[PDB]
Design a protein around this ligand. Structure first.
Ligand SMILES: O=C(O)CCC(=O)C(=O)O
Ligand SMILES: [Co+2]
Length: 350
């Protein structure tokens, strides 16, 4: 019924002093679990990789340690000009500041009623009792080019499409450089994960908009999750805080550095590399003072590729730790309802 069609949070958040009930977490699930302390500082050395020196042995070691410890790292000297990072996030902000009716010309609710992934709106509301996240998003298929539907790409500002195309071409370079270093450190060959991901590899842009929340202790901006694909390249406008990462059951603030990107692994990579590096669970907490904008570039595996532990990682004392599954089937499985506290990737573990 009506709960299947959410009104965007940017609208519902305007002027409120309490979060509407459908956003309120149970006390034990809250950031801070009922307190006002949401996460602990990340212990040093914080995971930071200089992409321009990634071929050097000491930089490769930093990448390996970051992926082993956290499953993510900040990247410096990554080749994306500050002006382009600023302009693509300005295009996003320009879009989200438009009136609701203008943005819903790109709505991800078909006919105003039926959820699909692509477009402006919210993640799927699967049940009336689902607690909703305090965010809206514009999600667009970027690659492969023949799978795009430009009808969902904002026409205003009119440079939106050009800026996203240019930015995505630069994050693809980051993807490649990271994947080649991961192939090298695992002794699989630099092209190993490039070839696994394949010609038809997916790239999806997700523009997240988190409105201010009067009670950041009661809600999530985006709930705890891991990304499903191979690797994600994340840009946070003006380095506004909110992103946190889980390790051994503890939540840590993901630090910021000016003019950096964040790289994290996804579940498909966790399978392909036999769990040597894992896909990190992460979340965003809101704040009371200001909106927060991010752009996630999700890089996936072509659908027909069987995800499996790389043969070069296996041996008499190195058992496979994950079952094989077609990438397209893994992504379908992620869409299915899951029991409270459970993770889909765990169902593939041996
Ligand atoms: O906004 C962020 O920093 C994280 C967004 C995220 O995790 C996602 O879109 O999957
Ligand atoms: Co994510």
């Amino acid at each position: 019924e009506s709960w299947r069609v959410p009104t965007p949070v940017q609208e519902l958040a305007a002027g409120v002093v309490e979060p509407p009930t459908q956003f309120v977490l149970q006390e034990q699930d809250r950031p801070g679990s009922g307190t006002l302390l949401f996460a602990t500082d990340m212990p040093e050395p914080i995971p930071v990789v200089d992409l321009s020196r990634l071929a050097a042995a000491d930089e490769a070691s930093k990448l390996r340690s970051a992926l082993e410890t956290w499953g993510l790292f900040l990247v410096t000297k990554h080749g994306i000009e500050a002006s382009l990072m600023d302009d693509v996030m300005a295009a996003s902000r320009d879009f989200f500041y438009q009136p609701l009716e203008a943005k819903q010309e790109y709505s991800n609710l078909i006919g105003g009623k039926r959820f699909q992934m692509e477009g402006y709106g919210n993640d799927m509301v699967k049940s009336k009792d689902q607690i909703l996240d305090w965010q809206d998003r514009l999600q667009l298929r970027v690659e492969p080019q023949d799978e795009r539907n430009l009808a969902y790409w904002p026409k205003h500002p009119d440079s939106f499409r050009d800026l996203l195309e240019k930015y995505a071409s630069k994050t693809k370079i980051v993807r490649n450089k990271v994947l080649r270093a991961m192939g090298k450190t695992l002794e699989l060959g630099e092209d190993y994960f490039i070839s696994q991901i394949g010609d038809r590899a997916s790239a999806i842009a997700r523009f997240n908009y988190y409105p201010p929340c009067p009670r950041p202790d009661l809600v999530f901006g985006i709930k705890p999750h891991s990304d499903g694909g191979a690797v994600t390249i994340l840009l946070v406008d003006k380095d506004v805080g909110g992103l946190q990462v889980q390790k051994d059951g503890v939540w840590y603030t993901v630090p910021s550095m000016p003019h950096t990107l964040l790289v994290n692994l996804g579940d498909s990579m966790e399978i392909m590399n036999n769990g040597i590096f894992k896909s990190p669970v992460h979340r965003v907490v809101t704040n009371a003072e200001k909106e927060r904008l991010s752009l996630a570039m999700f890089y996936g595996v072509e659908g027909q590729r069987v995800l499996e532990p790389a043969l070069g990682l296996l041996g008499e004392e190195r058992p496979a730790r994950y079952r094989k599954i077609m990438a397209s089937d893994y992504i379908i499985g992620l869409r299915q309802g899951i029991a409270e506290g459970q993770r889909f990737i765990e169902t593939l573990k041996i």
